[PDB]
Amino acid sequence: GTDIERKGTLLFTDISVDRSTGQIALRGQFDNPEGVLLPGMYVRVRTPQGLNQNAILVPQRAVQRSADGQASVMLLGEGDTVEVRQVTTGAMQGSRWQI
Amino acid sequence: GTDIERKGTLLFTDISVDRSTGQIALRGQFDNPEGVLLPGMYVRVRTPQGLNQNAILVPQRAVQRSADGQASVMLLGEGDTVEVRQVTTGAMQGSRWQI
Amino acid sequence: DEVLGKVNGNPKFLYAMMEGLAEAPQLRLVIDREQARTLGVSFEAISSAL
Amino acid sequence: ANTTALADYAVRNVNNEIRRLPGVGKLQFFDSEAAMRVWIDPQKLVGYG
């Protein structure tokens, strides 16, 4: 509900999955010099999920899917000929798919 | 349900929010000379939320709310003409809105 | 596709087309009913939420 | 343009008058109707249990 943004660091990643919710707990320490961050407040944390040095992003409309669910992409081959290269698609960012 | 008003001073504002509703509990002190206030009564407390010196108030009768919820005011343009200007809607006092 | 290949290549007709919506990719949700149930999750809750 | 406000005006003011006219046997209003939308944010619901 607020534009209040803060940065912090991840400290601890629990190893025991919660039995009821099937989740693992993580703890992050955040500076609160103004006292804005209040205990108990519900918040959202943007945790990075790893870095890809050679991420390939293509326009999302440029992905086809076959009857088996295998995704494929039309490619401009030598001699201006359209080639079908199969592809495995990752996550969805904006108007582009991560390949 | 009654016409009893009591003035009181804000003593304390909590730092921790309740988990179930995400709200902060506050405490004020009110003199109770006649025994009118009883322990455990549900009371609606009017708490000041900041004072602006350049606030604009027009009675609700003069502000119209369109079907999309945006409200506009009827201002007298040049040449004694009627102009539609959308306004961003704020708080409430008596029978006058805030802009 | 059989009939459209046999027809669209035949010069007797100006054009022929499936006046209809082409198949689209779908996102099937594989719900482990047993897993969800063991975590205490009813199928009613999942169905209602979705 | 909020087409829903336009459609609400048409339904409340226009369609009834025309369907009241002699000779016309049916009006086919080819759009939707107003409705309080409740756009829930499941992440907020998560936060509040």
3-class DSSP state of A29 = strand
Beta bridge partners of B43: none
Chain pair A-D, CB pairs under 8 angstroms: 4
The rounded distance, in Å, linking the Cα atoms of B23 and B16 is 9
Closest CA to A8 of A23, A27, A36, A21: A27
- Distance CA(B92)–CA(B61), nearest Å, equals 13
- First CA to last CA distance, chain D: 37
Q: What is the dihedral of CA C31, C32, C33, C34, to 10 degrees?
A: -170
Per CB-CB distance under 8 Å, the chain A contacts of C23 are 67
Q: Which technique was the structure solved with, according to the deposited record?
A: cryo-EM
The widest CA-to-CA distance across chain C, in whole angstroms, is: 64
Q: Residue B59 pairs with which residues in a beta bridge?
A: B96
Tokens of C48: 């209602």
Name B98's bridge partners: B57
Residue B56: C-alpha distances to residues B47, B59, D31 (Å):
20, 10, 40
Alpha-helical runs (H) found in D1-49:
3-9, 16-19, 42-47
Q: Which residue has the tokens 């082409």?
A: C22
Structure tokens at A2: 């607020």
Q: Nearest Cα to D4, choosing from D29, D26, D28?
A: D29
B81–D contact, CB cutoff 8 A: no
Separation in Å, CA B50 to CA B7, B33, B34, B47, B55: 17, 29, 31, 9, 11
Do D44 and A2 contact (CB within 8 A), yes or no? no
Q: Which tokens go with C11?
A: 């010069």
- How far is Cα A97 from Cα A59, in angstroms, rounded to an integer? 7
- Compute the distance between CA of residue C13 and CA of residue C6 in angstroms, rounded to an integer: 11
The CA angle B98-A1-D34, to the nearest 5 degrees, is 70
- A1 reaches C (C-beta below 8 A): no
Question: What tokens does A57 get?
Answer: 């992003």
- Alpha-helix residue ranges (DSSP H) falling in chain C: 2-8, 33-38, 43-49
Nearest-Cα distance to chain C for A20, in Å, is: 5
10 Å CB burial of residue A38 (0-12, 13-18, 19+) is: middle
- Touch criterion met for C and B (3+ Cβ pairs within 8 Å): no
Residues C38 and C25: their CA atoms lie apart, in Å, by 31
Report DSSP state, residue C36: H
Answer whether A38 sits within 8 Å of B22, measured CB to CB: no
- Cα dist. B80→A11, B61, B77, B83, B85 in Å? 67, 21, 6, 10, 15
Distance of CA D1 to the CA centre of its chain: 14
Q: Which two tokens stand for residue A37?
A: 């961050």
Chains C and A are in contact, defined as 3 or more C-beta pairs closer than 8 angstroms: yes
Distance of CA D6 to the CA centre of its chain: 9
Q: Is the Cβ of A42 closer than 8 Å to some Cβ of chain D?
A: yes
Backbone φ, ψ for residue A44 (5° rounding): -115, 135
C40 touches chain A (CB under 8 A): yes
Angstroms from B17 CA to nearest CA on chain D: 12
Q: Give the integer Cα–Cα distance in Å for C34 and C38.
A: 6
> What distance in Å separates the CA atoms of residue D4 and residue B14, rounded to the nearest whole number?
44
Tokens 């902060």 sit at which residue?
B24
Q: Are B59 and B97 in contact (CB under 8 A)?
A: yes
- Long-range contacts at B29-38 (CB < 8 A, ≥ 24 apart): B30/B6, B31/B6, B31/B7, B32/B6, B36/B4, B36/B6, B37/B6
User: For chain D, what's the residue count?
Assistant: 49
Instruction: Please name which of D15, D14, D3, D13 lies closest in space to residue B67, comparing C-alpha atoms.
Output: D3
